[PDB]
Structure formats: structure tokens, C-alpha cells
Amino acid sequence: VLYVGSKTKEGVVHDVTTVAEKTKEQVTNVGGAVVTGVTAVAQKTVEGAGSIAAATGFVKK
Amino acid sequence: VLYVGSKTKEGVVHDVTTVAEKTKEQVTNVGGAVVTGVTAVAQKTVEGAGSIAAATGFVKK
Amino acid sequence: VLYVGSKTKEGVVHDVTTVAEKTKEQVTNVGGAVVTGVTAVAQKTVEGAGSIAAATGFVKK
Amino acid sequence: VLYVGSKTKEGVVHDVTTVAEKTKEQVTNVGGAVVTGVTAVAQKTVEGAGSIAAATGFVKK
Amino acid sequence: VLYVGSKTKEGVVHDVTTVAEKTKEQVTNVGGAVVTGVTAVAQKTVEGAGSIAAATGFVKK
Amino acid sequence: VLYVGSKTKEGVVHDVTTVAEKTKEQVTNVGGAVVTGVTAVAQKTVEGAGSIAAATGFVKK
Numbered sequence: 001v002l003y004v005g006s007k008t009k010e011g012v013v014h015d016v017t018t019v020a021e022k023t024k025e026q027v028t029n030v031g032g033a034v035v036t037g038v039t040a041v042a043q044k045t046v047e048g049a050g051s052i053a054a055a056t057g058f059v060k061k
Numbered sequence: 062v063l064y065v066g067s068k069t070k071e072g073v074v075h076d077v078t079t080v081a082e083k084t085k086e087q088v089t090n091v092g093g094a095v096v097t098g099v100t101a102v103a104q105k106t107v108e109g110a111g112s113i114a115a116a117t118g119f120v121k122k
Numbered sequence: 123v124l125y126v127g128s129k130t131k132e133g134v135v136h137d138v139t140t141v142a143e144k145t146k147e148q149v150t151n152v153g154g155a156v157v158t159g160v161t162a163v164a165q166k167t168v169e170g171a172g173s174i175a176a177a178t179g180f181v182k183k
Numbered sequence: 184v185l186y187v188g189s190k191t192k193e194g195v196v197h198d199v200t201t202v203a204e205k206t207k208e209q210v211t212n213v214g215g216a217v218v219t220g221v222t223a224v225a226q227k228t229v230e231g232a233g234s235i236a237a238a239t240g241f242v243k244k
Numbered sequence: 245v246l247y248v249g250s251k252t253k254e255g256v257v258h259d260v261t262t263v264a265e266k267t268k269e270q271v272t273n274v275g276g277a278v279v280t281g282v283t284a285v286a287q288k289t290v291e292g293a294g295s296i297a298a299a300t301g302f303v304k305k
Numbered sequence: 306v307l308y309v310g311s312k313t314k315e316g317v318v319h320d321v322t323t324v325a326e327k328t329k330e331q332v333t334n335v336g337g338a339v340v341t342g343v344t345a346v347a348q349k350t351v352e353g354a355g356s357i358a359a360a361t362g363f364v365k366k
Contacts, residue, residue: 011105014137015075032179041172044133050102057093197259215301224294258320276362285355288316
């Protein structure tokens with residue numbers, strides 16, 4: 001592995017834009033909720049996951 | 062593996078734009094919910110997943 | 123592993139912009155909730171996850 | 184002219200709403216211009232006009 | 245002219261609302277310009293006008 | 306002219322609201338300009354005008 005002249009981007013997340021306005025969100029009767037917005041993950045070498053969003057619920061009433 | 066002159070992008074996520082306005086969201090009676098927005102993941106070498114969004118629920122009433 | 127002349131970005135998260143205005147959020151009757159905004163994670167070598175957002179709930183009424 | 188019990192509205196202008204957003208206006212090469220927005224005029228007894236918007240121009244080039 | 249019990253509104257201008265956001269205006273090469281916004285005029289008895297917006301121009305180039 | 310019990314509003318201008326945000330205005334090459342905002346005028350008895358916005362210009366170049 002060698003690089004004489006290079007520009008190597010390996011596992012990069014850039015130039016991510018996000019605009020949100022006058023939005024609205026309501027979660028009313030939820031067992032388990034997960035509400036996220038922007039979620040940027042970068043990694044060169046992995047063994048597990050990169051982004052996990054898990055939810056387990058129960059609503060009896 | 063060698064690079065004399067190069068521009069190598071390996072596992073890159075760039076120039077991601079997102080605009081949202083006057084939106085509306087409602088989750089009312091949910092066991093388990095997962096609401097996400099932008100989710101940018103980049104990785105060169107992986108062994109597991111890249112993005113997991115799991116939900117397991119139950120609604121009795 | 124060697125680099126004579128290079129610009130190597132390995133596991134980088136940059137230039138992440140986010141604008142939010144006049145938004146609204148309501149979580150009313152939730153067992154377990156997780157509300158996030160921007161979540162930037164970068165890492166070269168991993169063994170576990172990169173970002174975990176888990177929620178487990180229960181709503182009896 | 185008499186009023187025992189009354190609610191007389193004589194020459195009234197009420198409940199005027201106006202919303203403008205992300206608009207755009209350009210007047211570039213104009214002799215005489217008149218740009219107005221909301222213009223509410225009320226009057227019981229008149230002898231002249233109620234609202235005058237006059238413009239007289241000339242463009243030679 | 246007499247009023248025993250009354251609520252007489254004679255030449256009234258009320259409850260005028262106006263919202264403007266992220267607007268834009270440009271007048272570039274104008275002889276005479278008149279740019280107005282909200283203009284509320286009320287008067288019971290008149291002999292002339294109520295609101296005059298006049299403009300007289302000339303553009304030679 | 307007489308009033309036993311009354312609430313007479315004669316030439317009134319009330320409850321005028323105005324909201325402006327992130328607006329922009331540019332007048333660049335103008336002979337005579339008149340830029341106004343809110344202009345509330347009330348008067349019971351008049352002989353002339355109520356609001357005059359006049360502009361007379363000239364642009365040679």
C-alpha cells in the first residue's frame with residue numbers, strides 16, 4: 001500500500017445540507033418511539049453497524 | 062496497491078441536499094415507531110449493515 | 123503502508139449544514155422516546171456501532 | 184334622522200388580512216412607477232376620490 | 245340628528261393585518277418612484293381625496 | 306345634533322397590525338423616490354387630502 005501523489009477520500013460524508021421550516025410532528029400514544037433528524041455517519045473499516053434506530057413498543061388501552 | 066497520480070473517492074456520500082417545508086407528521090397509536098429524516102452513511106469496508114431501522118410493536122385495545 | 127505526497131481523508135464528516143425554523147414537535151403519551159437532531163459520527167476503525175438510538179416502551183391506560 | 188337602538192356601520196373597512204411571502208418585484212427602466220401594497224380607505228361622505236394612484240412616464244433610450 | 249342608544253361607526257378602518265416575509269423589491273432605473281406598504285385612511289366628511297400616490301418620471305439614456 | 310347614550314367612532318383607525326421579516330428593498334438609480342411603511346391617517350372633517358406620496362424624477366445617463 002503506497003501513494004505517491006493522490007487525494008484519496010475513504011469513508012467520507014461531506015456537503016450535506018438540510019432545510020426544514022414550518023414543519024410539524026406529533027407522536028401521541030406510542031410505546032417506544034425514535035424520532036431523528038440528520039444522521040451522518042462515516043467510517044473506513046467496520047465490524048458492526050453504521051447507524052441503528054430500533055424501537056420496541058406496546059400499547060394496551 | 063499503489064497510486065502515482067489519482068483522485069480516488071472510495072465510499073463517499075456528498076452533495077446531499079434536502080428541503081422540507083410546511084410538512085406534517087402524526088403517529089398516534091403505535092407500539093414501536095421509528096421516524097427518521099436524512100440518514101447519510103458511508104464506509105469503505107464493512108462486515109455488518111450500513112443503516113438499520115427496525116421496529117416491533119403491539120396494539121391491544 | 124506509506125504516503126510520499128498525499129491528502130488522505132479517512133473517516134471524515136465535514137461540511138454538514140442544517141437550518142430549522144418555526145418547527146414544532148410534540149410527544150405526548152410515550153413510554154420511552156428518543157428525539158435527536160444532527161448527529162455526526164466519524165471513526166476510522168470500528169468494532170461496535172457508530173450511532174445507536176434505541177427506545178423500548180409501554181403504555182397501559 | 185334618529186336611532187333608538189342600533190348598530191350602524193357607515194363607511195367601514197375592517198377585517199382585512201394579507202399574507203405575502205417569498206415574493207419578488209422588479210421595476211427596472213420606468214419613467215414613473217407607483218407600487219403599493221394594502222390600501223384601505225373608508226369615508227362616510229365624499230366629494231372627490233377615495234384612492235388615486237396615477238403615474239405618467241417617458242422612456243427615450 | 246339624534247341617537248338614543250347606538251353604536252355608530254362612521255368612517256372607521258380597523259382590524260387590518262399584514263404579514264410579509266422573505267420578500268424582495270428592486271427599482272433600478274426609475275425617474276420617479278413611489279413604493280408604499282400599508283396605507284389606512286379613514287375620514288367622516290371629505291372635500292378632496294383620501295390617498296394620493298402620484299409619480300411622474302423621465303428616463304433618457 | 307345630540308346623543309343621549311352612544312358610542313360613536315367618527316374617523317377612527319385602530320387595530321392595525323403589521324409584521325415584516327427578512328425583507329429586502331433596493332432603489333438604485335432613481336431621480337426621486339418615496340418609500341413608506343405603515344401610514345395610518347384618520348380625520349373627521351377634511352378640506353384637502355388625507356395622505357399624499359408624490360415623486361417627480363429624471364434619469365439622464
